[PDB]
């Protein structure tokens, strides 16, 4: 048989099939098959054509995406997609009347639109163009301008700035419609005093002079953006007068200093909840605000405030959790770390500070997935005590002891990692199994949790992989100080414990990272194992997530310490296993993992022959405020400046003499600025250490254009193969 | 068997070349720094006296970078806080020490961040540039007279050059020219208002949180150019109560019709200044000869004293029109000019007559006019043994052109085939500086009968050292192509056996008027590769190279990236045909223009070269500066030479790099050949899916010349060449 080759990985030869559906009610979903949109009845599996592919055969633009209005009356068509940062982009939009069969030609959505969204019910539109908000009541009618303060790189109304996009909301959107669309809530960010990161963009060969890209980006300790929050009533908008936006100000506990808006969740038609986080991210407050029908204002009663703090670290995994409100809005369920530091579901009454934990144990809840009148549905890693597995559970709102695992025993050898998609009122759910075996998508009914049918079993891919010498995956743990620390290994085919193999350590090791899991992947590690016979291992030490706060907070204010030492120790335990070749152990990572690779290579352990750092952080003062400060505090003498200075890659330059190093970075990286790698190379040069390097002209943090992606993986394969003496 | 010349020897300067750097102070005395002391030497008898004691340099606290004693010897200017800018420019702090009063001047001090400073040619007047304006000090202790008030960073330059004139026109930061006796101060003013800026990131020390963007007015080929104006101020009529009057000398109408440049300033007498102007299309230039008018206070450049210089086959001059050497009365001058056969020879002109008389001729060229007296003109040429790569001093009777004497040819013919000279203030004495093929030799001579006075430095110390080292040898010879000689040089390993097949590295420049094949003795990276690694390091001078006539030099006019590239490939073919070269192991490397030719050669698909290294290469001519590029390429317009600008890019050759091993190196703060150039090569390589090796150098400029980066690049490059040539490595403890 043949092996899974680099070409197979770079050309996507063996494709993973998915079953991406969009729910449209509590009994029907839409499914895009052969470019045509089908509407499926969930109970009987019968289909009808919703939108036939030929409809737009004369549109004249390639359509990137689509979005049907909740009432199914109109379809929004996305084209001219232009990527900005990780989540952002701009686009052109066209509106089609699905009943009249007419494209909207007057009062259109402008070109270079930043964000657009339908109301949760009906067909109102809200959009952001030139950093201002606009609302369309009817797709054929002129838009009402909501904001007038919009200014590129300065004022953002209803869109996020670089740092909130990346670190807080993981989205460009800063617009939140009320459940029935009466109100439109939005945030406004002000970057006036945020310093700019400047870098050269070379563009096409014809560009005579390079362009300087300038982005407001706050590095650790710098002046941060300010935020304001507003609510406009879209039902009282006028063609003759400018819109009235009511401001909801942050509480006094937050107003005394630098802070962030970290969550927006509507509770009812007249009740909105907001979470605010201090710049020192171990203290947060939730305001529960109500609309006053008689005054037009929004009252956040001090009696409905909920405080959340951490004595051992920061609040939340990456931010405070979102609340899941009951229909009356008088109570909510929220993931909170308990007295033992394990993240569990807490039940709050809006007027009561103390909550009741409805789950418990030495395992964590990952997310609350659906809340109904009788049950709360959640994902957790409780099953077989495996932190790297995922399963759906349901718990009875009137009896916490009434827990049922809905996914645990459906296909236990194939499916140990699930995600779920519930119908509009949770009558049905799609289970998405993603490992250890081939992905499996199934449809279920919540009536009595019974399987309806298999949506996608990846039989086509299984037929293909039967003729390929595929690698296997081992998931196990080592015991350190009477604590379990899990690892995974991508093992070559026909693996023999009596033979010795080179080993590559694939690192992330960031706070709340998890690199040891039950997910099935087709990646670079598949090629290295299948073709090159390299063991590709990953380890979750101190600072990794989903195992409790004693493990996750262990690196609080001390990045570049325990998580680094634990990767070295892991490799020691691996080498001192009879199938590893101690002379050929390598380490690699991208992003935070690039940082840990570099720290490991500069540690003087003598364990690693060689390593690759792709776009690494080198010093924490160069990275953004929101992420860095969460774990490190402020880079001031009064706070944590001493550890900011003690945890640089540069300080370890002399030790790189003991290793072969490949340093890679994209020149247009807006995230981990090229500066970071430019500072590593200069430190290496200053102590006279030889190393290998590669820059990627105009590539960002992803190094993801078709040609650069192919080049980096080809270049890296050569480096590893030469290090491991492979032909 | 003895030890070899190692990379460490090259990087740590283990074997040092001694020099004898002297400064003439009269027609019979020179100054020389020995044991940090300033010694004054009598040229005739070789006796010395101490001018300034080594210890005097320590009564200031700070370290002195350089010094400059005033012509009359009454004062000493002391340079400190030296901060490098471009190739020639820098800023610094200055202190003046009164040699008669034996005290440091502390009042009306030369300001910090001074751009340029110079004494008058006679006496002790000072002229300086601070914040892009000119200032004059009549007496070191007296307040300075502000000459200009228009100075503005990156916009108006008064008496200093902008980036492009410093690099390509004057090879200096200075744009100040004192009259022979210091009565007048002439200066240029450059205006960069509409010149676009090259912007690049500077990272600085690790403590800098946000990188800084460096912005420099830099005109790329075809872009808007700086404008120039020229002025003369009389320093003897300066007033404390009124602003100074600067008289403007305007360019002629033949230049004013379009874009142009000021390309030379040479004083003829106390009251006569000459200027040369060049059109943006550098095949036409005009010399104005301007006299001072006592009846007006102005400078009249009579139309009848103009001198036109043009070229039908290329550009004017080697890199610019030559400088004139005027006779004492200022009524005649001697100037290097290309003749009818295209060989550069000395022409004699009358200031009022258009036709000149060639005083030298032959299939060889004059390199420079070195001194002119009442009876003799002294010059350097490559006439001897018909060797373009050799250099010798000659003298000629101004009264009989056939009466030529070689003053250096036969002093030490096996050791000395490459000379430079330094004449005393009225040419009574001269220092000869021999720089190859043997060890450098410095000797003192008297011009009265060309009598050899004494040996100043024979490098005996270094000879003693190199006797215990297995040194490589140097072969200088030629190949015949189309009945034309093309010279080459080869750094050959010690105990060189012609019966073996050695690997070969081709060390390239190949720029217009380049000369890489010569008789100079060098201690460099090529010495290590030959001595230790047993690699032959060859260099070839093909079409476009200088000092052999215009048929060779102009052959690449409007066609850079053609003949000079093909000729390097052909050279290597002839080298692999020589029998002692291993055809499977031929590499090519080069910096700057040589980086460009390396890249073009590697992308040619010839199959001759296994591997190559391009250090800071030009990749496309539109990315390089106007003055250099346009000289050979014309304008990048459809009407002019855009088609060849597009046809001569490295990027267009990306697919062919599949056949070779490539190392691309570039400094991130290179203000000259912008990192952009290499960033465009790597993107082209990536787009066609070609693998290659790369290395950037954080905050390093075009020289990659800081102690640590210099050591790193040469170490990294040695490893690349050794792996390409299958040569073994050596482990080290740490
Ligand atoms: C998957 O298959 C399902 C079952 O076949 C589909 O559901 C069926 O949909 C149709 C149309 O939406 C419904 O048809 C008519 O229902 C009543 C009569 O109901 C009785 O007969 C049905 C069979 O004809 C049975 O299935 C029922 O159980 C029941 O015994 C009629 O009175 C309706 O008429 C009204 O609407 C029509 C328009 O279609 C007008 O023309 C009439 O004048 C009148 O106003 C419907 O015609 C049927 O009820 C429904 N059955 C069930 C059990 O759901 C389902 O739509 C399909 N899903 C997809 C996505 O394809
Ligand atoms: N910018 C943060 C981060 C990163 C990238 C590059 C370098 C470094 Cl040091 C960090 C890590 C956390 C990520 N994140 C944030 C929201 C919750 C889910 C999640 O996974 C995003 C990418
Ligand atoms: N910028 C011009 C040049 C160069 C550097 C790098 C790349 C390229 Cl393409 C060209 C070549 C000519 C040199 N020069 C100019 C003054 C006269 C004497 C001389 O030797 C200087 C450096
Ligand atoms: C978008 O741009 C195109 C091309 O310039 C133009 O024809 C079109 O009308 C624009 N669309 C809108 C909604 O303005
Ligand atoms: C933005 O903040 C600046 C100060 O950083 C302030 O002057 C300005 O008024 C603010 N703008 C808005 C729209 O709030
Ligand atoms: C709305 O606000 C803008 C900006 O302040 C102003 O130009 C416009 O005239 C206002 N319109 C009305 C009706 O107030
Ligand atoms: C939406 O909610 C608002 C506020 O409670 C209410 O006034 C309105 O009637 C609701 N609309 C619908 C369609 O129920
Ligand atoms: C939050 O962190 C700061 C900085 O370490 C500290 O002063 C404060 O005590 C912390 N809060 C809690 C409740 O631990
Ligand atoms: C284990 O305990 C020892 C002793 O306290 C300590 O040095 C080490 O860092 C601890 N952590 C792990 C995970 O080994
Ligand atoms: C050299 O010696 C002569 C005496 O013959 C003397 O007059 C002269 O000044 C001396 N010069 C120096 C610089 O020592
Ligand atoms: C130059 O700088 C030094 C150090 O800052 C200062 O003491 C001195 O006064 C300056 N000199 C002048 C002439 O301004
Ligand atoms: C510089 O040139 C600009 C035109 O490009 C002109 O407006 C300006 O006055 C000039 N300045 C001087 C001092 O020549
Ligand atoms: C000299 O020129 C400057 C700038 O134009 C002016 O400020 C100053 O008053 C002038 N000096 C005299 C003495 O006229
Ligand atoms: C210097 O030259 C000027 C101009 O010809 C003249 O006026 C002056 O007297 C000369 N001085 C000396 C010392 O020769
Ligand atoms: C100068 O160069 C241009 C462009 O090659 C040419 O057409 C012109 O005839 C030349 N001019 C002179 C003065 O020889």
A9 shares contact with chain B (CB less than 8 Å): no
Atom of ligand 5 nearest to the CA of A155: 13
Which ligand minimizes its atom distance to the CA of A150? Answer: 5
Neighbours of A691 (CB within 10 A): 19
Inspect the interface and report whether the beta carbons of A693 and B698 lie closer than 8 Å.
Answer: no
- Write the burial class of residue B62 (CB in 10 Å: 0-12 exposed, 13-18 middle, 19+ buried): exposed
Q: How far apart (Å, rounded) are the C-alpha atoms in residues A395 and A405?
A: 9
Q: Regarding beta strands B298-301 and A324-325, do their DSSP bridges make them parallel or antiparallel, or are they unpaired?
A: unpaired
Inspect the interface and report whether the beta carbons of B206 and A679 lie closer than 8 Å.
Answer: yes
What single string gives the DSSP state of each residue in B435-489? -SBSS-EEEEEETTTTEEEEEEE--HHHHHHHTTEE--EEEEEEEEETTEEEEEE
3-state secondary structure A173-226: ECEEECCCCCEEEEEEEECCCCCEEEEEECCCCCCCCCEEEEEECCECCCCCCE
Residues B679 and B729 in one domain: yes
Q: Let me know: does A361 contact A341? Beta carbons within 8 Å.
A: no
Residues B522 and B426 in one domain: no
- Distances, alpha carbon A33 to alpha carbons A17, A19, A36, A63, A265, in Å: 12, 10, 5, 15, 34
End-to-end alpha carbon distance in chain A: 19
Catalytic residue among A575, A591, A651, A705: A591
What single string gives the DSSP state of each residue in B176-210? EEE-TTSSEEEEEEEE-TTPPEEEEEE--STT-SS
CATH at A683: 3.40.50.1820
Q: Let me know: does B97 contact B111? Beta carbons within 8 Å.
A: no
A349 CB within 6 A, ligand 8: no
Q: What share of chain A is helix, strand, coil (3-state, %, to 5)?
A: 20, 35, 45
Q: How far apart (Å, rounded) are the C-alpha atoms in residues A636 and A645?
A: 11
Smallest CA–CA separation between B606 and chain A, in Å? 25
Q: How far apart (Å, rounded) are the C-alpha atoms in residues A52 and A35?
A: 8
**B592 labelled catalytic:** yes
Residues B444 and B481 in one domain: no
Q: How far apart (Å, rounded) are the C-alpha atoms in residues A266 and A179?
A: 7
Residues in chain A: 727
What spacing in Å lies between the alpha carbon of B28 and ligand 14's midpoint? 24
Residues of B within 8 A of A696 (CB-CB) are 682, 686
Which ligand minimizes its atom distance to the CA of B232? Answer: 14
Of the candidates A619, A690, A718, the beta carbon closest to that of B691 is on: A718
**B288 labelled catalytic:** no
| CA dihedral angle for residue B24, residue B30, residue B32, residue B38, rounded to 10 degrees | -110
A136 CB within 6 A, ligand 9: no
Neighbours of B291 (CB within 10 A): 18
Residues of B within 8 A of A621 (CB-CB) are 209
Atom of ligand 8 nearest to the CA of A312: 14
Cα A673 versus chain centre, distance: 20
- Which of A278, A282, A636, A639 maximizes ligand 8 atoms within 8 Å of its Cβ, making it the mutation to test the pocket? A282
Residues B553 and B594 in one domain: yes
Smallest CA–CA separation between B687 and chain A, in Å? 5
The protein residue with its alpha carbon nearest to ligand 4, atom 3, reads A111
Please say which residue of A433, A458, A483 terminates a domain. Answer: A458
Of the candidates B211, B223, B684, the beta carbon closest to that of A675 is on: B211
Q: Name the strand (E) or helix (H) holding B367.
A: strand B366-372
Comparing C-alpha atoms, which of A582, A600, A565, A558 is closest to residue A481? Answer: A565
What spacing in Å lies between the alpha carbon of A518 and ligand 1's midpoint? 44
B220 shares contact with chain A (CB less than 8 Å): yes
Which ligand minimizes its atom distance to the CA of B180? Answer: 14
Beta bridge partners of A299: A290
Inspect the interface and report whether the beta carbons of A199 and B201 lie closer than 8 Å.
Answer: yes
Maximum CA pair distance of chain A? 83
Q: How far apart (Å, rounded) are the C-alpha atoms in residues B235 and A33?
A: 89
Q: How far apart (Å, rounded) are the C-alpha atoms in residues A300 and A307?
A: 14
B694 shares contact with chain A (CB less than 8 Å): yes
Residues A167 and A216 in one domain: yes
What spacing in Å lies between the alpha carbon of B152 and ligand 8's midpoint? 52
**B670 labelled catalytic:** yes
Residues B521 and B554 in one domain: yes
B535 CB within 6 A, ligand 10: no
Please say which residue of A458, A487, A522 terminates a domain. Answer: A458
Smallest CA–CA separation between B12 and chain A, in Å? 13
- Distances, alpha carbon A604 to alpha carbons A607, A658, B7, B651, B734, in Å: 8, 7, 27, 42, 12
Residues A429 and A481 in one domain: no
Residues B379 and B508 in one domain: no
Angle at B702 between CA B700 and CA B707, to 5 degrees: 50
What spacing in Å lies between the alpha carbon of B252 and ligand 12's midpoint? 20
A621 shares contact with chain B (CB less than 8 Å): yes
**Domain, as residue range, for A258:** 16-458
A661 shares contact with chain B (CB less than 8 Å): no
Inspect the interface and report whether the beta carbons of B683 and A698 lie closer than 8 Å.
Answer: yes
Of the candidates B682, B691, B709, the beta carbon closest to that of A714 is on: B691
| CA dihedral angle for residue A236, residue A241, residue A242, residue A248, rounded to 10 degrees | -40
Inspect the interface and report whether the beta carbons of B213 and A202 lie closer than 8 Å.
Answer: no
Residues A431 and A478 in one domain: no
Comparing C-alpha atoms, which of A231, A249, A257 is closest to residue A287? Answer: A249
Token digits of residue A726: 């492979």
| B interface test, pick of A7, A202, A217 with most B CB neighbours within 10 Å | A202
Q: Let me know: does A458 contact A438? Beta carbons within 8 Å.
A: yes
- If DSSP codes are grouped into helix, strand and coil, which group holds residue A643? helix
What spacing in Å lies between the alpha carbon of A429 and ligand 7's midpoint? 29
Residue B83: partners with Cβ closer than 8 Å, 6 or more residues away: B90, B91, B92
Residues of A within 8 A of B211 (CB-CB) are 197-199, 673, 675
Catalytic residue among B592, B606, B648, B682: B592
Neighbours of B584 (CB within 10 A): 11
Smallest CA–CA separation between B165 and chain A, in Å? 20
Catalytic residue among B567, B670, B671, B701: B670
Q: How far apart (Å, rounded) are the C-alpha atoms in residues B228 and A427?
A: 82
Residue A44: partners with Cβ closer than 8 Å, 6 or more residues away: none
B224 shares contact with chain A (CB less than 8 Å): no
Beta bridge partners of A152: none
Based on the structure, what is the number of domains in chain A? Answer: 2
Which ligand minimizes its atom distance to the CA of A643? Answer: 8
Q: How far apart (Å, rounded) are the C-alpha atoms in residues B209 and B132?
A: 31
Catalytic residue among A263, A669, A670, A700: A669
Q: How far apart (Å, rounded) are the C-alpha atoms in residues B481 and B479?
A: 7
A717 shares contact with chain B (CB less than 8 Å): no
What single string gives the DSSP state of each residue in B252-288? PHHHHTS-EEEEEEEE-SSSEEEEEEEESSTTEEEEE
Of the candidates B213, B682, B719, the beta carbon closest to that of A697 is on: B682
Dihedral sign (CA B314, B320, B325, B326): positive
Q: How far apart (Å, rounded) are the C-alpha atoms in residues B625 and B631?
A: 10
What are the b/e assignments for A233-259, b being 16+ CB within 10 Å?
Answer: bbeebeeeeebebbebebbeebeeeeb
| CA dihedral angle for residue B360, residue B363, residue B369, residue B374, rounded to 10 degrees | -20
Inspect the interface and report whether the beta carbons of B694 and A698 lie closer than 8 Å.
Answer: no
Q: What are phi and psi of A149, to 5 degrees?
A: -90, -15
Inspect the interface and report whether the beta carbons of A695 and B694 lie closer than 8 Å.
Answer: yes
What spacing in Å lies between the alpha carbon of B283 and ligand 15's midpoint? 6
Q: Let me know: does A187 contact B198? Beta carbons within 8 Å.
A: no
Token digits of residue A11: 């050309």
Neighbours of B191 (CB within 10 A): 18
Q: Regarding beta strands B366-372 and B357-358, do their DSSP bridges make them parallel or antiparallel, or are they unpaired?
A: unpaired
Residues B528 and B589 in one domain: yes
CATH at A215: 2.140.10.30
Q: What share of chain B is helix, strand, coil (3-state, %, to 5)?
A: 20, 35, 45
Q: How far apart (Å, rounded) are the C-alpha atoms in residues A392 and A380?
A: 7
Which ligand minimizes its atom distance to the CA of B50? Answer: 10
Token digits of residue A287: 């305001």
* Cα nearest neighbour of B700 on chain A: A682
B709 shares contact with chain A (CB less than 8 Å): yes
| CA dihedral angle for residue B525, residue B529, residue B530, residue B531, rounded to 10 degrees | 90
- Within 13 A of B1's CA, how many CA atoms are on the CB side? 7
Please say which residue of A419, A434, A458 terminates a domain. Answer: A458
User: Cis ω on the peptide bond leading into residue B437 (within 30° of 0)?
Assistant: yes
How many beta-carbon pairs below 8 A join chains A and B?
121
Q: Let me know: does A698 contact A669? Beta carbons within 8 Å.
A: no
Atom of ligand 15 nearest to the CA of B312: 14
Atom of ligand 10 nearest to the CA of B40: 13
Residues A180 and A249 in one domain: yes
Q: Name the strand (E) or helix (H) holding B566.
A: helix B563-576
Residues A152 and A238 in one domain: yes
Residue matched to tokens 């009876």 = B375
Token digits of residue B674: 């912008």
């Amino acid at each position: 048989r043949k092996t899974y080759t680099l070409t197979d990985y770079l050309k996507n030869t063996y494709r993973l099939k998915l079953y991406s559906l969009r729910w449209i009610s509590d009994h029907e979903y839409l499914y895009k098959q052969e470019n045509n949109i089908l509407v499926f009845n969930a109970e009987y599996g019968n289909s009808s054509v919703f939108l036939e592919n030929s409809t737009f055969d004369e549109f004249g633009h390639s359509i990137n995406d689509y979005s049907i209005s909740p009432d199914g009356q109109f379809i929004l068509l996305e084209y001219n997609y232009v990527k900005q940062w990780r989540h952002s982009y701009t686009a052109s939009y066209d509106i089609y009347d699905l009943n009249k069969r007419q494209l909207i030609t007057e009062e259109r959505i402008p070109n270079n639109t930043q964000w657009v969204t339908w109301s949760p019910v009906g067909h109102k539109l809200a959009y952001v163009w030139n950093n201002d908000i606009y609302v369309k009541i009817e797709p054929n009618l002129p838009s009402y301008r909501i904001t007038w303060t919009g200014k590129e790189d300065i004022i953002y109304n209803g869109i996020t700035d670089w740092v909130y996009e990346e670190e807080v909301f993981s989205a460009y959107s800063a617009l939140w419609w009320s459940p029935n669309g009466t109100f439109l809530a939005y945030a406004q960010f002000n970057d006036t005093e945020v310093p700019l990161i400047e870098y050269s963009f070379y563009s096409d060969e014809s560009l005579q002079y390079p362009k300087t890209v300038r982005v407001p980006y706050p590095k650790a300790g710098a002046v941060n953006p300010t935020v304001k929050f507003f609510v406009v009533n879209t039902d009282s908008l006028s063609s003759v007068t400018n819109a009235t936006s009511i401001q909801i100000t942050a509480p006094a506990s937050m107003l005394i200093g630098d802070h962030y808006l970290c969550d927006v969740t509507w509770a009812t038609q007249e009740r909105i909840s907001l979470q605010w986080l201090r710049r020192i991210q171990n203290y947060s407050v939730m305001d529960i605000c109500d609309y006053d029908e008689s005054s037009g204002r929004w009252n956040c009663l001090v009696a409905r405030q909920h405080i959340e703090m951490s004595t051992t670290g920061w609040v939340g995994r990456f931010r405070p959790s979102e609340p899941h409100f009951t229909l009356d809005g008088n109570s909510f369920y929220k993931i909170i770390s308990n007295e033992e530091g394990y993240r569990h579901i807490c039940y709050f009454q809006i007027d009561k500070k103390d909550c009741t934990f409805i789950t418990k144990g030495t395992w964590e809840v990952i997310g609350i997935e659906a809340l109904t009148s009788d049950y709360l549905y959640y994902i957790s890693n409780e099953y077989k005590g495996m932190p790297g597995g995922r399963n759906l559970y349901k718990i009875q709102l009137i009896d916490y002891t009434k827990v049922t695992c809905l996914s645990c025993e459906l296909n236990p050898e194939r499916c140990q990692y699930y995600s779920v998609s519930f119908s509009k009122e949770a009558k049905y759910y799609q289970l998405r199994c993603s490992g250890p075996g081939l992905p499996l998508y199934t449809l279920h009914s919540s009536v009595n949790d019974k399987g309806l049918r298999v949506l996608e079993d990846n039989s086509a891919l299984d037929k293909m992989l039967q003729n390929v010498q595929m690698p296997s995956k081992k998931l196990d743990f080592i015991i350190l100080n009477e604590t379990k620390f899990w690892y995974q290994m991508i093992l070559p085919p026909h693996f023999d414990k009596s033979k010795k193999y080179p080993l590559l350590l694939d690192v992330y090791a960031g706070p709340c990272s998890q690199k040891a899991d039950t997910v099935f992947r087709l990646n670079w590690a598949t090629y290295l194992a299948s073709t090159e016979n390299i063991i590709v291992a990953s380890f979750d030490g101190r600072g990794s997530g989903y195992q409790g706060d004693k493990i996750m907070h262990a690196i609080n204010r001390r990045l570049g310490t325990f998580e680094v030492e634990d990767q070295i120790e892991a490799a020691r335990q691996f080498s001192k296993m009879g199938f590893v070749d101690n002379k050929r152990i390598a380490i690699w990572g991208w992003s935070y993992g690039g940082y840990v690779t570099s720290m490991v290579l500069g540690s003087g352990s003598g364990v690693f022959k060689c390593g690759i750092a792709v776009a690494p952080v080198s010093r924490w003062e160069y990275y953004d405020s929101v992420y860095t400060e969460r774990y490190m505090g402020l880079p001031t003498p009064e706070d944590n400046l001493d550890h900011y200075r003690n945890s640089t890659v540069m300080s370890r330059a002399e030790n790189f003499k003991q290793v072969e190093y490949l340093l890679i970075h994209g020149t247009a990286d807006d995230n981990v600025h090229f500066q970071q790698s430019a500072q590593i190379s200069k430190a290496l040069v200053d102590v006279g250490v030889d190393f290998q390097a590669m820059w990627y002209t105009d590539e960002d943090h992803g190094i993801a254009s078709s040609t650069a992606h192919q080049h980096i993986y080809t270049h890296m394969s050569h480096f590893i193969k030469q290090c491991f003496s492979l032909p």
